[PDB]
Amino acid sequence: TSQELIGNCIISSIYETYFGHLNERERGDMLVILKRLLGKFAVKYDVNYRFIDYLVTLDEKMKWLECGLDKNDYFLENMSIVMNSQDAVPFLLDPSSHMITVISNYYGNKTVLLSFLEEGFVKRLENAVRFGSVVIIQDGEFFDPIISRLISREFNHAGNRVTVEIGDHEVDVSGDFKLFIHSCDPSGDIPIFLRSRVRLVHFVTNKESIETRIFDITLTEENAEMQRKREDLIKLNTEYRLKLKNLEKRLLEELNNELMVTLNNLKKEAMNIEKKLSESEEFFPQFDNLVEEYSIIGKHSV
Amino acid sequence: EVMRPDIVIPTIDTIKHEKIFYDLLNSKRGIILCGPPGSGKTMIMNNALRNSSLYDVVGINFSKDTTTEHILSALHRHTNYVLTLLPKSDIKNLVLFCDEINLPKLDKYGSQNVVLFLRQLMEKQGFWKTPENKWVTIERIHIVGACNPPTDPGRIPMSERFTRHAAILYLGYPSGKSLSQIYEIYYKAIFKLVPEFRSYTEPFARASVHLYNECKARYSTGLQSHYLFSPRELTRLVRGVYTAINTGPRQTLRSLIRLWAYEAWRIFADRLVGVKEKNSFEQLLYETVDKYLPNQDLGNISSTSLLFSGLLSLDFKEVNKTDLVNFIEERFKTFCDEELEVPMVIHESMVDHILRIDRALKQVQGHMMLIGASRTGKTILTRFVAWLNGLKIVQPKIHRHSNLSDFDMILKKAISDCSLKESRTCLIIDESNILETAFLERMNTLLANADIPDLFQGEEYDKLLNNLRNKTRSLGLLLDTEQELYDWFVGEIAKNLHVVFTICDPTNNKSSAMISSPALFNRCIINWMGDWDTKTMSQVANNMVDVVPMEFTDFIVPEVNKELVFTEPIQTIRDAVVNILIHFDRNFYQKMKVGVNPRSPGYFIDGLRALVKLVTAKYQDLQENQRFVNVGLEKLNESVLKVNEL
Amino acid sequence: VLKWIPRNLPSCLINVESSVTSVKLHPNLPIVFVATDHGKLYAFDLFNYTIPLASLQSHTKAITSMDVLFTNYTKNYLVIVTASKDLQIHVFKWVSEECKFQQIRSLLGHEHIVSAVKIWQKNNDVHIASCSRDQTVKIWDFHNGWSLKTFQPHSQWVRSIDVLGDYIISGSHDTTLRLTHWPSGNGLSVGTGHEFPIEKVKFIHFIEDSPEIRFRTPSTDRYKNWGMQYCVSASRDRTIKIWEIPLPTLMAHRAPIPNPTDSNFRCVLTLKGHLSWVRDISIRGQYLFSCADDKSVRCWDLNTGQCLHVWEKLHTGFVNCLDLDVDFDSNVTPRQMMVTGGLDCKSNVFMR
Amino acid sequence: VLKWIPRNLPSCLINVESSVTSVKLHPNLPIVFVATDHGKLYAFDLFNYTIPLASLQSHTKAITSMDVLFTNYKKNYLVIVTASKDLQIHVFKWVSEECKFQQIRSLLGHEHIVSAVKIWQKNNDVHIASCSRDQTVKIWDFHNGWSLKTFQPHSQWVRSIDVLGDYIISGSHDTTLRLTHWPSGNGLSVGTGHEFPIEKVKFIHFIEIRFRTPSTDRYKNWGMQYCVSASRDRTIKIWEIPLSNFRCVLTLKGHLSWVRDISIRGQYLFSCADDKSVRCWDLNTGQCLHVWEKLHTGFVNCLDLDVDFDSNVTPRQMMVTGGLDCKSNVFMR
């Protein structure tokens, strides 16, 4: 697992900074050509790499899904891209206008809603930046260039304070301030200065998303037993892994300063992990056969 | 006396045109000069009028927003109301000179006002006063004008009822012999500074003429919309060579050849886009130098191997590349410490762009038009260079709820700061800083002329003249006439104001209007930096991934073609990582179907920063996990050894 | 004794971890004080320079300036004063029994980075003056520690200052000089003629007796009572310029007021030849020394105004600071040594 | 100057988390690089040693040895090379403007535990040589990272190595230390006489002593006159490489325990052993001058002194030692 750290890191970074504004088929094609480039230059990488399985933790995934995010894996990946854009302001393009309440639920009462069409937009944005509340701006296709310094993050550090210039007056920058830009027009004209400096994330529904959603519906309704078993095995694997790591830490704490009972508990946990792995080793091919079987319905749907 | 724009080297075509000009003007007949944008209509006509003992000149420059009140005000300062209108000089006649009569715009029903006014005043020999209603007969006031052909955009086709009164003369480009003679005279005037190379005036002039001819024949307008050359490029080459020789050190023949080659690079080949075009131009310089200047001991004439600058010394000489990079690094560190902080990575292309921006910002009335992809580093380099030269950066705060009032008052504040307070200003204009065509017309006015007339009028004009008189009296100068004060004002503006245009999407229609505008193209120096190439991307990536732990696994050198490696030949994991990142950026922009639009390297930089942070975090976590499992294994071995011993 | 010129080669090369910003000299003992770009104040022995004699990390950011003073009361000890971009001013005390730094206090009140500190004493009263990006030239007190007087003498941010009794001169980033009367805060005059922000400004003090000096001798009894004649400034336009202080309206036992007709600095002599921003200047006897970002140290002279010796390639990087002992003080010996400090993490010393 | 004798008491006592395995000095800064027994690398300031200036978990097992070098060529940056039990030779550089460690590369290829490393600079190239317990010593390239050569000097493990010029002398687990050429890769001379494995065997470079001064014109032209080796037989022996066997010139005694590392400081030789003591034995008279008693609670495993034969590195008077009592004494001036 240490021989392929660089390849996985490269794939994850490229996936974050390049694939935010692509549908599923384009994402698959560019992932295939990236894997081909990795294999041509003799850089090893994880064969069964999944972005959610590598960078999305279970607590974060449950927190996002309980906030109102769709069950689709595409929306999970886009949500992870949005929350992992720590340096650049993310640009959520949601035609359904669904994610405003999602981010509001994620950040609670700190969420402050502005817009680019308000008469008192600039002074309230300055107040929000001073207080440091999470800011969501609607109608991003009408981007007012007054916050061009905030998009480019061109600050000057006045000693112990970070300073941005908005309008003709000086305003401080709080450390907890965040900026989200929301748009609802897929055909809107984003300014190139704004477009090149934001994390453009497309929360849209397409024909590839039609394929994925038909498969999700037929999985969750035609045979819910397989999906429920997969969810249960993933949950128990995560819980048993956390308990095993905690037990290992307790064992080393005891050995540094019953011990046979703790060793027996660790052995039982390891046997449980082995049994769960053996059970799950004969479950993914079943999902592969279901994928191969329910393709004609998807072609008919598209 | 080559900086002077009014100087005209007398050739056979010039005296022929001056003679037919005197014949036509003495014939009581208007004259229309038509030809290519570098033929020399304005300078021939001004030479013919200034050196005449019978004709005065009135300078008028037409724009799209031009009314007959401008012409009335221009005549009223050179005539007396005694009807009958007469010039102030009794014997010398008066000539009214119009610039680019094609540029006045049609009204809502297809009729330009000023050309109909001119046809009225030189057909009936008079005009009717609007607020008083009498016929003011004009006796000896003449009308001339120049114009580009109406084919190109911005040049409106003109009514035959107006052109039937004025004789039309066509001015073609001068032949090879005439250009050779003119620039032989210019190069003799230049080389009077260095008399030991006076025998090389003819080969330099012939080489410049051949270079201009080859560039005109090679890069036609069919490739790109801005690939048009003219004798103005050769004149700018001569002016740049003189400016560099004047402030340079003691020069050798090789130094002179390299200096001329650097000027040719900075003038004839900063508008070029394709890499094949730049390679062809490099081959063209090598061929020209070998043909006309058969000298040995000549180094590389590549774009990055010609670093002429005056930051590192008191005189304009060639500087070492590594010393210049170190100086630029330290200056940028200081600039980020004192002004806005941007973590930039220094590469050869950025150094070269800094050099050419600095060269174009030290010229009198020197303006720039930076064209390139977004996030290529145009605004930050312009701010850094303007900070180096001591200019004051003025960035217009133009937002969505803004109109001509805010932009005009920003322009007025900048102009007043330049004149009254005597502070040099580098005005940075973005394509999103303009919103309507009126701002574009304001830029055309400010760039073609040295002043914008309608900003100061009435009370504004009176207070401007009062402030001009106050400044003149405070400086210990004596100027009385308003014409002298206005000349001093426009001279101060042309000396202390520089305009730099930032263009991000050259294929846009608004940016196409910006590029194809007559005043912007004929005055600004285009620096098409374009998108990053493979070498610059390799340098940035190598400077970014060297600060992260990356080489900790076994690596075998992969067999690969020579053309698939953009960095140095692959020896480690870092070169492989850089190659994969560049290859994927190229493939991503290929499969996104960008077409011929410039490719922003913002995705590449964001990917590199995310990769650095992610690799650091994952390596730290992996090291902690491995240390944890090894210390646990060591404790386990100690426990089993204690059990075995006991 | 005042005609000493440094040799073509440095006497000793002192190595420091980061970029050297400000270098002074101990007036009594041969000890070099070097302030680096980490704020780590140093103290080297001149004859044993392999290891620092003492070191201390007071500020967490880069020290921008420094000045020392040996007290002469009417006990005596050196008072190092260091200022950094971490917005404070830290006053030190050098103890020789332990051969270690001993910080006595610190000063606060600047809300941006501070770029120059000068410390002087008038009569049993030591004062600390400084200037920052706040455009405020605040005046502290060594004993009480409380600030005494502050003023904003410039539109842009002041970079360097100098002190002489009750008169404070101060260049600034607005490329203009201005002499301000310290006790009253009234700006006596202004000066223009530099095209770039000022790096260093200091007074050209008088000499009691000399064979031939033009810039350090009063022209009349008015200048004799005034106590100073000229001033020297170095800015980023590669030029060192000599000015003349214009006499304002004066009254006995009263505060001075500016003269509207005779309140402008007059450029007497300009000295060109440096290839980059002249960073630091210093005057010893008839010789004016200076350094710039040309990696070189030059030796002008005042009586005729042209360079004598050029120490090219003294550092691989830029040169930041010089220090020579004060020649116009009876209590300070003008011993023959000159010290330089560069951006290449080094500090050459010329002795003997 | 070069006749420095450290004082009878410590000046600073750097406290680390675990037992210190190898110590090196910054050639021009007052900074000590102590290596822990958990792979962690600690850099301390010699005027403020309460808190470590920088700490980095390099390896996963104990560091076996490490050596530093200040490059003289392209900026001049210091290079730290550390070896551990993980069959990896990690390379680090020390950015002084941020006082933090940075990783360049990990030299891999060994099939067993590594023992020691040595870094020397050519006219413009930097090399790395390391000896493992796989009966092989390899020569690396600092920038390239490849393996220049691989030679087997003995049939057993190698616990010490030093390279001077094109000749490298290695002290194997067997008492037969051998000297082999770097580019040629052919052994020339061997020498036996120790009753146990050799712990440290390094050259004795010429300085302006009894063995440093060349005795013959051929030896002066060759550049190598004598080498001092320390074995586990509680003795220190000084050899003499012929210009077909390595003779012995002297055999210093008085070591209670096995001698771990030695260091020659001009005309005086200083060494530390496992007997919790360090003795400064004169190289001319062969007699111990001053011996430190109760210097550390544990056994001293590493003694570091500034290089005296290099013109680039200033031979300053800074000698520090590294014991096994989770501490390191500092002697200054």
Ligand SMILES: Nc1ncnc2c1ncn2[C@@H]1O[C@H](COP(=O)(O)OP(=O)(O)O)[C@@H](O)[C@H]1O
């Ligand atoms: N006979 C000549 N002597 C000197 N310069 C010439 C001559 N013919 C052309 N030029 C150059 O050609 C350029 C034509 O410029 P200009 O007259 O402003 O263009 P336009 O005629 O389109 O207004 C001038 O810069 C001038 O230097």
Ligand SMILES: Nc1ncnc2c1ncn2[C@@H]1O[C@H](COP(=O)(O)OP(=O)(O)O)[C@@H](O)[C@H]1O
């Ligand atoms: N070495 C470099 N050269 C050019 N651009 C860089 C470099 N390093 C970073 N950048 C990017 O350039 C941006 C600043 O360029 P800027 O001039 O604002 O672009 P634009 O010309 O589109 O306004 C930064 O946001 C940064 O991400």
Ligand SMILES: [Mg+2]
């Ligand atoms: Mg024209």
